[PDB]
Amino acid sequence: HMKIHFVGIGGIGMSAVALHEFSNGNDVYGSNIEETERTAYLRKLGIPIFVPHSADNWYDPDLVIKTPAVRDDNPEIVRARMERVPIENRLHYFRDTLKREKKEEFAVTGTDGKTTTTAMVAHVLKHLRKSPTVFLGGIMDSLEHGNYEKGNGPVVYELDESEEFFSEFSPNYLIITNARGDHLENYGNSLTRYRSAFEKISRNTDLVVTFAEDELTSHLGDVTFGVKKGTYTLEMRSASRAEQKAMVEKNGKRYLELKLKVPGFHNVLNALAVIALFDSLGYDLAPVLEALEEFRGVHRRFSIAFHDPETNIYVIDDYAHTPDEIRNLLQTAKEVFENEKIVVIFQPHRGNFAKALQLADEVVVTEVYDSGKMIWDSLKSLGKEAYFVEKLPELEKVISVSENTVFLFVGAGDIIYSSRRFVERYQSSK
Template identity: 30%
Template sequence: NVNDADIVVVSTAIPHDNPELLEARRRNIPIWHRAEMLGWLMEGTHAIAVAGSHGKSTITGMLGAILETAGCDPTVVIGADAIAYQSNVRIGGGSWMVVEADESDGSFVHLMPRYAIVSNVELDHTNHFPTIGELLDAFVDFLRCLPYDGIAAIGVDCPNARMLLDTVGIRTTTFALRADADYRAAGIEIAPSKSSFCLCYKGEALTQIELNIPGAFNVTNALAAATIAHAIGIEPEAIASGLSSFRGIKRRFEILGKMPDRNVLVVDDYAHHPSEVRAALQTARTFHSKRILTVFQPHRYTRTRALHSEFGPAFAVADMVWVTEIYSAWEQPIAGVSGQLIADAIKAVCPDKPVFFKHDFDAIIEDVRNEVNDDDMVLVLGAGDIYRVAYQLVAE
């Protein structure tokens, strides 16, 4: 497949012994990292890079919807499929580009944005960044890629992200729900399948925002998108209209439907960090008062080793939990590290909660089918292939 290639583009997920990569090297074909290719595509555009530990895909999709509504015809590159696009990419004809900036391997320093968002920074990707200090250093390097006339929007509810304000010599603006910030969300109302708030800039109301997707965390995501949109000159009315039209991202609290012949809602979500698990369960609880049965697939041995104890309290809202074996994401196993660590952490915090550690997806599906009652919810969580369980539960 590389016979006629001028350049071969790879991501960090491609192993070094991949046959096409080896053949490209043998033929002396230039090999670019995916982030280098995105950086090249961003040159000469009004590019916005969306970074942060959580919410990147959703914020990127929201910004795409805002710019599309504003008539900018943007190109949008997301790390997951947008429901509106049925793809992770929208090819636009305008000069605007929105790109999700992946911090997991540090490659986001190859991007060439004019504007940026850092929504939050939490310890993660410990295979690449063993400490929070090293991760913050990477975000500093990323922000220093912005030109002198660029703007970075920083989510200052997050203490780690707030620290970036004092370390980068670029123009910044801030957003927050709780902390003092340039942009704030006032009068927040959370309903089962939607939410609303008033977008305020330096104490002045700009517009009312109505979101048609669930979750309090999406208020923060929308505030991030609205902040950079207003900072670059998009009218408040276009911001509100774009956010109202946004339909969501696949595997981000995606309601798949009900189990056949059962009044049991099945929801699929990409959550794989303790903060994301907690947010997904809190969203489920806002509109579901009955039992929430949760299936969780840990992602990466290094993340499980570093954060397993934090997963315990994250599952407090769940009524029953099944934990699978770890999805390796190409990592080598680590002695003593398995999904059992997370199951044990949950039991340590909630000793009366039914928690099961099982390797086999089919066994978990059988368990869930036997355990559910009408009006329960099944919430399937994880960044690996656990979505297969969710889809099988709603299959005819």
């Protein structure tokens, strides 16, 4: 039995590992740079969480775990090193944690779609009553602790291909959503090391599911999914307000109809990768499809934060920060909400943006999280109705609440709090 100190315990990754250790009866506590929903959540469980970082937050741990972001001048790390307490890195510790688990492993990695795909896998395994241990890089309400759940079945987790060390894992099954290799910083900016990393994890995995259209990684798959090419393919897709349907072909033959409560074309691809994995493992797909149909999504991946049915008003949260992610988000907003007014409140993240937001009816841009006016400027140039609001607390206030309108609060940062405040405003308003 050990006492573990988590430096950066407020992150989605770290809180999962902390919760797991907490679930295993270890003395757990940690610290974080800022307060987060995880720090709030973990405190409610009775875990001491100290914000901000200070060597004051030392309680003679047997072990200290840190995220790649924790710098060597972090006072906690300095104390730990001087106190000679062993310090470990999140991923590396996680791998060791799996080694201890000695369980069947379902890993999902990739540039995009990774967290939702992982949530889908976890959701299927839970539906099939396989009671999996889940480590999610996002929040799924069906999970006992949101981004984590302890079970005695297999373990499902997300592997971040940002850290080259992901290639050191060797799960039973691995879904690789895609691999654009847009963050080679940890691969000495070498697409070759990046490729090698995938090559390597593929070699040590029993079954690899891969995106037939992913230039970099398609050949590694034992089975593939794609739209027009691959083992599992899409013959037809129809998106509607309450759900979207897709006719799936297997090696070219109509094989099944996929129904998802969750919208967006990309979620079909994520569901396809899931189907591919489970079908490949010989699972009766009837319950797998029932589960996929019921999958409720991960917070901030086009999640409905609030809906007023009397007024036909929606507040939706989405992590998008890239022009393409925004073009996609809006395309799915239009598929789901054919006639409603679409209002995007976008907080850019630490040119093409204006063209991506063109599909919205109203755009409010804020300052970047950690220039925003340049986007406003661009929007203004494409000649459409946009606003710039620089102070984050003003965001919810600036908005005109109108019926038949979907308010999409878009961004990877702070914006998530405006969204909640906007909902609270609305509610108190009623």
